Amino acid sequence: FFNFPNXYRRCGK
Amino acid sequence: HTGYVGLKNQGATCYMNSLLQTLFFTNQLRKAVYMMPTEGDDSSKSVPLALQRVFYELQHSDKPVGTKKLTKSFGWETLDSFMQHDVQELCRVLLDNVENKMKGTCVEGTIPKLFRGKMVSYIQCKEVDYRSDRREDYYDIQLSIKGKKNIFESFVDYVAVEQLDGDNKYDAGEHGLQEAEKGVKFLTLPPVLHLQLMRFMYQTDQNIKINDRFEFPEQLPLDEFLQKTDPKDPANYILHAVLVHSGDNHGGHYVVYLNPKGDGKWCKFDDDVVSRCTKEEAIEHNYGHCTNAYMLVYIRESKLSEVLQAVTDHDIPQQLVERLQEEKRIEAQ
């Protein structure tokens, strides 16, 4: 966050 | 010029330039950073020294400032480092370092008194007589966006009561499984409010952007979201920084809109390019190359003058000035 689109699920946690 | 100097595009720093200007014009934070006891630190590994260097260059240099040493300082050097992490994490990395440096000093606790607030998270059982109240601290607020049109609705959703029904029943221990309600309400709000706008979702395999329209006001009243408001200090806030990203298919460009003096005289900080812009361009035009606003900074009205103190060249200690000029001498040779 906020660097989209990306396939990383560490954003916002 | 414009009285404000820019930061050079030096690698995949992404939001880093936007965050640095935001903290730089957190003037009270800046003066605290200048007066930190960083004499005798290692330049190659000191985050407090690096932040002092970039702030000093941002205050005196007439040419755009470089951030190479600071990037080396906190070691975000893997190819995906800045796009995997968050703006919050980078702000935490910097602010924790500075606050830790200020421990034992006259300016200690400046970061908590500017950014941290008190919050209570509660779980209340409905049929049995049990409740669990625990206090939390926060330095930033992540706001829901999808389905919410403005910050007011966004905050209402944050304080909205969550239901814990069957298959989610709260473990009340002595009282067994219970059909409770879970929520959070605001105790206090900091002088500087960091609001992150969670405009994304994850189908395919990626986190995509929610380009939906979202409104944020120049002045944000938040008294009604406090558990008990305080007269003579309403939770009234003034918009300070609007961190924006621009959205072609891959792309990505991070600029920050600022009124550094809190006077509504707004500038656009596009790295090395600092220019004047209309207040419509900073606020209304960022509601939503698809440009999206993702982070907002508000300053409490009662604290506006103290947070945005005037900062003079003599506020910087002479020994700090001596070391930085010595470094610039070594590079010039």
- What residues form DSSP beta bridges with B194? B297
Distance of alpha carbon B169 from alpha carbon B178, whole angstroms:
5
In a 13 Å sphere around the CA of B111, the CA atoms on its Cβ side amount to: 21
CA distance B196 to chain A (A): 9
- The DSSP call for residue A6 is B
Give the integer Cα–Cα distance in Å for B47 and B152.
37
Type of residue found at B198: M
Give B-chain residues touching A12 at CB under 8 angstroms.
86, 142, 198, 200
Residue B284 tokens read as 């209304």
| Cβ–Cβ contact B295 with A under 8 A | yes
Interface of B with A in 13-72 (CB under 8 A): 14-15
| Phi, psi dihedrals of residue B30, rounded to the nearest 5° | -65, -50
Structure tokens at B174: 């002595």
Contact of B277 with B270, CB cutoff 8 Å: no
d(CA B295, CA B293): 6
Are the C-beta atoms of residues B239 and B218 closer than 8 Å to each other? yes
Residues of chain B neighbouring A7 (CB-CB closer than 8 A) = 205-207
Give the resolution to one decimal, in Å.
2.9
Q: Which residue of A has its CA nearest to B141?
A: A12
Residue type, B85: H
Q: Give chain B as a 3 state SS string.
A: CCCCCCECCCCCCCCHHHHHHHHHCCHHHHHHHHCCCCCCCCCCCCHHHHHHHHHHHHHHCCCCECCHHHHHHCCCCCCCHHHHCCHHHHHHHHHHHHHHHCCCCCCCCHHHHHHCEEEEEEEEECCCCCEEEEEEEECCEEEECCCCCEHHHHHHHHHCCEEECCCCCEECHHHCEECEEEEEEECCCCCEEEEEEECEECCCCCEEECCCCCECCCEEECHHHECCCCCCCCCEEEEEEEEEEEECCCCCEEEEEECCCCCCCCEEEECCEEEECCHHHHCHHHCCCEEEEEEEEEEEHHHHHHHCCCCCHHHCCHHHHHHHHHHHHHHHC
List the helix and strand counts (H, then E) for chain A: 0, 0
Q: Residue B239 and residue B275: Cα distance in Å, rounded?
A: 19
Work out the number of other CB atoms within 10 angstroms of the CB of residue B158: 17
Cα of B219 vs its chain's centroid, Å: 17
Whether A5 sits inside 8 A of B142 (CB atoms) is no
B214 in contact with chain A, both atoms CB, cutoff 8 A = no
Q: Which residues of B60-74 are buried (b: 16+ CB within 10 A; e: fewer)?
A: eeeebbbbebbbebb
| Contact criterion met (CB < 8 Å) for B207 and A6 | yes
Task: Give me the amino acid identity at B260.
Answer: P
Dihedral sign of CA atoms B162, B168, B171, B176 in order = positive
Q: How far is B238 from chain A (nearest CA, A)?
A: 23
- d(CA B211, CA B197) in angstroms, rounded, equals 11
For residues B237 and B257, give the distance between their C-alpha atoms in angstroms, rounded to a whole number: 17
Cα–Cα distance for residue pair B239/B283, rounded to 1 Å: 9
Is residue B151 within 8 A of residue B65, CB to CB? The reply is: no
Q: Does B81 touch chain A (CB under 8 A)?
A: no
- Given a contact cutoff of 8 angstroms between Cβ atoms, the answer to whether B265 and B14 are in contact is no
The distance of B247 to chain A (nearest Cα, Å) reads 8
Min Cα–Cα distance to chain B from A9, Å: 8
Ordered by where they begin, the domains of chain B are: 6-116+302-333 (no CATH), 117-138+159-189 (2.20.210.10), 139-158+190-301 (no CATH)
Closest residue on chain B to A7 (Cα): B206
Contact B197, B215 (CB under 8 A): no
Q: Write the CB contacts of B66 (distance below 8 Å, at least 6 apart in sequence).
A: B7, B8, B10, B57
Three-state SS annotation for B208-228: EECCCCCECCCEEECHHHECC
Confirm if B35 and B107 have CB atoms less than 8 A apart: yes
Task: Check CB contact of B289 with chain A, cutoff 8 Å.
Answer: no
- Single out the residue of B189, B122, B125, B132 nearest to residue B155, CA to CA: B189
Q: How many CA atoms lie within 13 A of B236 on its CB side?
A: 9
**Structure method:** X-ray
d(C-alpha B170, C-alpha B125), whole Å:
8
Burial class, B300, CB count within 10 angstroms (exposed 0-12 / middle 13-18 / buried 19+): buried
Q: Are strands B192-198 and B141-144 parallel, antiparallel or unpaired?
A: parallel
Q: How many CB pairs under 8 A join A and B?
A: 61
